[PDB]
Amino acid sequence: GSFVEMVDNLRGKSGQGYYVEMTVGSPPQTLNILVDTGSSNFAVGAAPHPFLHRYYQRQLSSTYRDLRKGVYVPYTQGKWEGELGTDLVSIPHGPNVTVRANIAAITESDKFFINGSNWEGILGLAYAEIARPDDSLEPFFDSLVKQTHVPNLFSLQLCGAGFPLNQSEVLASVGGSMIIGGIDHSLYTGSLWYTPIRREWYYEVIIVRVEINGQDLKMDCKEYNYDKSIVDSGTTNLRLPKKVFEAAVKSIKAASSTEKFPDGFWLGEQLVCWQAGTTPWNIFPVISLYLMGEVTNQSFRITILPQQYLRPVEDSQDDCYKFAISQSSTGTVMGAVIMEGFYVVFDRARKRIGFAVSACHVHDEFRTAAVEGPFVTLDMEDCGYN
Numbered sequence: 225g226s227f228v229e230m231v232d233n234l235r236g237k238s239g240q241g242y243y244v245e246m247t248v249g250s251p252p253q254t255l256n257i258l259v260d261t262g263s264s265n266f267a268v269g270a271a272p273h274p275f276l277h278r279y280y281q282r283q284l285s286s287t288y289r290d291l292r293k294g295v296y297v298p299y300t301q302g303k304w305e306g307e308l309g310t311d312l313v314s315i316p317h318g319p320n321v322t323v324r325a326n327i328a329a330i331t332e333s334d335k336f337f338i339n340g341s342n343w344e345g346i347l348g349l350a351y352a353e354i355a356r357p358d359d360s361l362e363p364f365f366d367s368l369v370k371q372t373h374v375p376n377l378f379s380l381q382l383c384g385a386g387f388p389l390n391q392s393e394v395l396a397s398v399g400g401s402m403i404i405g406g407i408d409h410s411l412y413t414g415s416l417w418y419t420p421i422r423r424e425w426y427y428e429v430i431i432v433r434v435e436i437n438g439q440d441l442k443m444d445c446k447e448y449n450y451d452k453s454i455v456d457s458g459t460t461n462l463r464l465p466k467k468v469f470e471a472a473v474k475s476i477k478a479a480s481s482t483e484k485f486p487d488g489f490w491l492g493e494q495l496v497c498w499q500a501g502t503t504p505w506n507i508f509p510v511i512s513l514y515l516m517g518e519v520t521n522q523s524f525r526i527t528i529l530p531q532q533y534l535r536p537v538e539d540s541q542d543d544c545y546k547f548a549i550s551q552s553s554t555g556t557v558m559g560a561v562i563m564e565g566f567y568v569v570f571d572r573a574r575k576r577i578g579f580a581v582s583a584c585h586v587h588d589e590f591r592t593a594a595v596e597g598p599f600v601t602l603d604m605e606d607c608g609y610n
């Protein structure tokens with residue numbers, strides 16, 4: 225229904241991620257926490273760092289419990305190393321509950337913390353399977369559901385501004401909403417359409433068809449989910465497997481052919497600028513992703529605009545952007561590019577993910593983002609990779 229206490233509780237932008245305010249310890253220590261559906265650890269800065277304005281101080285918390293166990297989390301972009309423990313955790317603009325959760329106290333990190341970001345930790349919302357060191361470390365959401373009456377579901381509305389936000393603006397602006405234990409009807413328009421969670425590790429989904437301006441990409445559907453397709457709030461871009469990316473970029477260049485862009489723009493490296501208010505949105509195509517439906521032989525589609533896939537950046541009074549669709553060697557990643565177009569319901573209780581047109585998506589007077597169905601699709605289980 226309505227969860228007014230949790231509506232507008234996020235801040236940030238796609239390129240830097242979105243964070244929620246949380247408290248750790250007794251007396252409560254306030255920290256800004258990155259919302260990450262692509263990882264399963266709750267981990268906070270717990271030692272001084274040049275990019276941290278604050279950090280978790282275990283010796284000042286009376287409820288802190290040392291697990292006497294190390295935790296190492298190397299990833300593609302960087303790494304962090306810490307010490308496992310437990311403490312009492314709350315979400316001020318969240319449910320009115322206090323939970324004892326696992327905390328990875330970060331003591332050493334490489335390329336993890338970001339200069340100028342207003343976050344000090346990460347909230348891994350995915351399943352116990354991918355948690356580090358192993359699945360025995362109960363993720364935050366599992367502890368919250370086990371210890372309280374909070375329904376096993378969360379929903380995210382990530383709000384892209386559609387223009388650059390400076391440091392004071394990104395601090396004063398509402399970046400979106402994280403609704404813990406419910407679906408807020410004010411954050412979306414139209415219907416919610418659900419896709420099954422294929423397996424509970426990452427939030428894995430199955431893409432069954434891809435269109436660029438209604439034109440079928442015409443690849444074997446396994447290619448779209450090779451080696452997996454996941455919904456990840458901790459990824460800025462829409463990331464596509466190498467073969468899909470090459471086919472998508474060729475189609476997008478063909479649809480936008482009235483204007484020639486250098487190779488560096490398509491690589492996500494170079495920005496493209498237009499005179500204030502003159503971005504030619506109409507020359508760029510819409511992108512539709514068809515997802516497996518809940519009903520046998522049934523699919524639905526989510527459609528995004530270049531206002532989602534052209535990430536706004538500051539250069540001048542020019543309107544500048546980076547191409548936010550990139551190659552992946554780890555399958556499809558429906559990051560902030562997708563997320564910003566839609567209100568996304570992570571229905572863990574019914575092993576499904578919901579999509580509806582976001583009330584905060586950026587569009588123009590001619591086109592809007594869309595969630596439509598049903599469509600008749602066959603051999604959909606065959607689209608999943610093994």
Ligand SMILES: CN1C(=N)N[C@@]2(c3cc(-c4cccc(C#N)c4)cs3)CN(C(=O)c3ccccc3)C[C@H]2C1=O
Nearest residue numbers: 238240241260262263297299300354456457458459460
């Ligand atoms: C994409 N992606 C992600 N979803 N989560 C991680 C990080 C995201 C960011 C980060 C920082 C600022 C902004 C944004 C944004 N947008 C993201 C830093 S680290 C954490 N991680 C695991 O812990 C893990 C480890 C092993 C296995 C699975 C997950 C995998 C990392 C990753 O590569």
